[PDB]
């Protein structure tokens, strides 16, 4: 683990901690590499070592979020509890889940880098068959209706999307006072959609 | 009583009206092209709707008055169930309606309409409300305040229309009227307490 390489690492990602922060605070289009740069303490020449366009930055963002979700899949694990984390990891951040829907039409549908987002295109399919094997072991556990597996996954995409819309409306964030009480029932709701009876 | 050349058509204005608005969107509908469609001339324009956002503000303003008789109509189980079939029914609708939230109820377009859709919505609220009070206190659902309810209730519709708008759903999702029912159960089911 050379010391040269931990740092690079380390850096790296704190251009990505500190790109997402903006992103998130300014929106996305008004940022630009340099001023992520001056944010981490770096200039030009340093931040190219890493990414060499915004886009690369935008689509590791996403690459990090699919990897992120295939290692909470990866023993007779807890299915119940994985269902849970599963909802939570979903529902954490819902400016960056906002953030995604528009990077999937800015530069995700273009290949603006191109062997990043078929890479991408992987790894969710990979996420896909992975959240789909939990439903059917839920499932074969009697824990979960037996419908098609694609209903409960269909379910669980419309839940966290509204989900996120929730906390998006001005309207909705002032009646929602005890917000952490209600993320966990919300969670609740997830662990327990489809329940067979 | 005769009146009804006026009743028959005024639906029908109204009918084919929405159906242009979803197939080409509403922005680019006029009401030339409604009248046409029906098979009138500009019969329309003193048949009520003096303007196109009257027709908007006519259908929001039906949508949620045939909402308020869904809770007229004693079965709280029946009746949560058919509250969500008629929210999730016609999810390009419910799309309509929330850009037309935005470039027409939020401006000074029509107000004597705007001023009763705020209030009707307000009533239908407040039944939505009661409908969950009483299901807590009927022991259906968790004991918690009844806005935990309304917003899940909202969320799963919600991401329920985003997903009929989906890539996925309209060409990976084979069986779609029984997904719809399985919906359903689960708006019904949400947030059960467990005896």
Not at 28 to 33: F, G, I, K, L, Y
Not at 69 to 93: G, I, N, P, Q, W
Not at 177 to 185: K, L
């Amino acid at each position: 683990e050379p010391r040269k390489v931990r740092e690079f690492r380390r850096r790296e990602q704190e251009i990505l901690d500190t790109a997402l922060k903006l992103f998130l605070e300014q929106g996305e289009d008004s940022v630009t590499v340099e001023m992520i740069a001056d944010a981490v303490g770096i200039g030009k020449g340093t931040i190219y070592k890493h990414f060499k366009s915004k886009a690369e930055i935008y689509l590791r963002l996403m690459l990090d979020y699919e990897r992120d979700l295939a290692a909470l899949f990866h023993v007779a694990r807890d299915k119940e509890a994985l269902s849970r984390a599963y909802f939570e990891f979903r529902m954490r951040d819902p400016q960056r889940y906002r953030l995604f829907d528009r990077l999937e039409e800015k530069v995700v549908k273009t290949s603006q880098v191109p062997e990043m987002v078929e890479e991408l295109h992987k790894i969710r399919a990979s996420n896909f068959e992975r959240l789909t094997q939990l439903i059917k072991e839920r499932i074969a556990d009697g824990k979960l209706e037996n419908v098609p597996p694609y209903f409960h996954y269909c379910a669980a995409w419309a839940l966290v999307h509204g989900a996120v819309a929730l906390y998006h409306s001005p309207f909705w964030r002032e009646v929602l006072e005890d917000q952490e009480g209600f993320f966990h029932f919300l969670m609740d709701i997830g662990v327990r959609m489809g329940n067979k009876r």
